[PDB]
Curated annotation (Swiss-Prot), chain B:
Pathway in which this enzyme or protein is active: Antibiotic biosynthesis
Protein name: Deoxynogalonate monooxygenase
Catalyzed chemical reaction(s): deoxynogalonate + O2 = nogalonate + H2O + H(+)
Full protein stretch here: 10 to 106 of 118
Lineage of the organism: Bacteria, Bacillati, Actinomycetota, Actinomycetes, Kitasatosporales
Enzyme category, top tier: oxidoreductase
Keyword Oxidoreductase annotated: yes
Keyword Transcription tagged: no
Length: 97, 97
């Protein structure tokens, strides 16, 4: 299978510190799932309420098994309370180096 | 500031995706010769032919800006403008695992 990259754009409606806490707990959850490779949370420079998360998984099935975990639900609910999300699943076509 | 910057550029490709990808490879190689270039990833949305995201990391904003100001960037920018629409943002990494 090929690696998949999940890209999630967040518009944060409450306090960014609270969002980062909730996000940190979400990321720790995913980080102990089989097939998790890496993640980066990015904050937009000219804004205070704009974030993008990039998460890499070994394959599509590992990503969906993680998302299907009942243990994700509290994290999904908390994130939904604090933010509007637009997400997509991608594959990498070029990487340099 | 002196913070590492991550440039996120979302593209809708209206010409041939193969031509878009080829132009991008040459664009990335140009950037790879620029001081302060860290890494480049071109992502394609799964089961869309026409939706891409470039993630480009630079040691700081000034190194990025200077790269975009080089005369050598112009042919690449010109080719991308012929083939795609795009929306960009500049970000700083907040969390990583
Ligand atoms: Cl990442």
């Amino acid at each position: 299978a090929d690696e998949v990259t999940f890209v999630n754009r967040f518009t944060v409606h409450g306090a960014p510190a609270e969002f980062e806490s909730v996000f940190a707990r979400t990321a720790a959850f995913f980080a102990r799932q089989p097939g998790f490779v890496r993640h980066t949370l990015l904050r937009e420079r000219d804004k205070d309420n704009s974030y993008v998360n990039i998460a890499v998984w070994t394959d599509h099935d590992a990503f969906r098994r993680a998302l299907a975990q009942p243990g994700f639900l509290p994290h999904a609910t908390a994130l939904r309370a604090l933010s509007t999300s637009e997400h997509g699943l991608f594959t990498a076509r070029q990487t340099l180096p």
